[PDB]
Design a protein around this ligand. Structure first.
Ligand SMILES: Nc1ncnc2c1ncn2[C@@H]1O[C@H](COP(=O)(O)OP(=O)(O)OP(=O)(O)O)[C@@H](O)[C@H]1O
Ligand SMILES: Nc1ncnc2c1ncn2[C@@H]1O[C@H](COP(=O)(O)OP(=O)(O)OP(=O)(O)O)[C@@H](O)[C@H]1O
Ligand code: NA
Ligand code: NA
Lengths: 235, 235
């Protein structure tokens, strides 16, 4: 499958924070979107997911233009999303958080949902926080739960907005391994994070945006060796 | 001046998440507190600042045990704090956010507060977001504003909980430079962040905690070469 964004544009009160951004992600591929603070990364993710209306552009899966589909419909088509901001339910336990998302799984019976929640807790090493309320979790614990919640939806394409934020080095390795397994399982992954080295390590190719514009695209080595990228982003 | 925490301990429902942690930070020194997710770092910061009551231990500045002082009193004694979680006022502009914190500055006249806010916006490269509401900021923009807010309080000791979270590489350099300037100006700095290399680069020494216990203390090189730290934290 192929997820394509064409000529995306977003302005806020006349300020064009995204301008003519096009990107593509395929099944079984991990693709990066990186760039300076305020460059328009999250806004771009928002327009793909359907969180904010676009001023221009198109969203397409395979042959179908899904630009007119609302958030819920795009999700049903297979678009998944891990927000940068906290997304956990504060009063619910880790287990109840997972079971809540799993309620959307029409392909799973009641018992299958319960098995999946236990599987996810095992996979993300959070079984010991099973009954812990979301609001009681440390930053890194919460991030694992939020990633697990995103996966519980069983997306075809997953947009990961800063999956490494607040996560320790061993957990970065674990999450990288999980992302690679998603890719091997046939998911397309679009990832943005400010841990450049760790993000480029998992990506096959990456887009670099700056001030709402795409300034570079290529393999990690090509990106790292790009003089313009070095100047305005890598430093 | 010297800030000292002695034998700090915190339990939640019988689970000891911090146990007998002691640390010291001096004026003109940058000290790190690092370790795995859930190790008790933020909880330790909370007990020093006065955000959560300690089960045991003491907080001391120079000769004065300030363990009995509430949050506001400890702040007046010079303890400053940048939370890990969002701390910006969502509906207020960047400028109004700064002016709000600066209202606590008894040492500054009305006009002096306004000058300081403009200085801070210049220093943190956020002048262009002057009238932007906190809720409209990107993640990295918001972090700069939050760091600026923490500094506006003019603390003697500043506890920085993940100052690099969501920040781009050039901004990491800028913030490092600002931290070093704080140190040269006589502040003591206690910093925790999950960007290990960048954090150790600014620290003179660091404490490593794991499962509520201090497992190592030393210079950055000593930490990085510690086999136990490599095993349970660095990977
Ligand atoms: N609701 C809004 N109103 C006005 N401006 C906004 C709004 N939301 C975002 N912006 C601005 O749009 C720009 C792009 O923000 P976005 O969150 O897409 O950046 P980003 O590349 O994800 O940044 P970061 O790396 O700092 O997370 C930012 O400069 C931000 O100030
Ligand atoms: N209110 C609470 N009730 C119960 N447990 C809590 C509460 N707050 C924190 N905890 C637990 O205390 C432990 C220590 O959390 P803390 O936030 O101090 O860790 P941290 O070292 O800052 O972690 P991270 O690196 O993930 O931010 C965590 O395992 C967390 O689940
Ligand atoms: Na963002
Ligand atoms: Na923390």
């Amino acid at each position: 499958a192929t997820l394509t964004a064409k000529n995306l544009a977003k302005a806020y009160k006349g300020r064009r924070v995204v301008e003519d951004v096009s990107l593509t992600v395929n099944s079984g591929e991990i693709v990066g979107l990186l760039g300076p603070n305020g460059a328009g990364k999250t806004t771009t993710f928002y327009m793909v997911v359907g969180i904010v209306p676009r001023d221009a552009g198109n969203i397409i899966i395979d042959d179908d233009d899904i630009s007119l589909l609302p958030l819920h419909a795009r999700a049903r088509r297979g678009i998944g999303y891990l927000p940068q901001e906290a997304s956990i339910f504060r009063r619910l336990s880790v287990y109840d958080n997972l079971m809540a998302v799993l309620q959307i799984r029409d392909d799973l019976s009641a018992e299958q949902r319960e098995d999946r929640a236990n599987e996810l807790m095992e996979e993300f090493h959070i079984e010991h926080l099973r009954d812990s309320m979301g609001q009681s979790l440390s930053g890194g614990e919460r991030r694992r739960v939020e990633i697990a919640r995103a996966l519980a939806a069983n997306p075809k394409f997953i947009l990961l907005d800063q999956p490494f934020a607040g996560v320790d080095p061993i957990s970065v390795i674990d999450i990288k391994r999980i992302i690679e397994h998603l890719r091997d399982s046939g998911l397309g992954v679009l990832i943005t994070d400010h841990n450049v080295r760790e993000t480029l390590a998992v990506c096959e190719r990456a887009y670099i945006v700056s001030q709402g514009h795409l300034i570079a695209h290529g393999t990690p080595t090509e990106i790292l060796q790009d003089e313009h990228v070095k100047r305005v982003y890598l430093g």
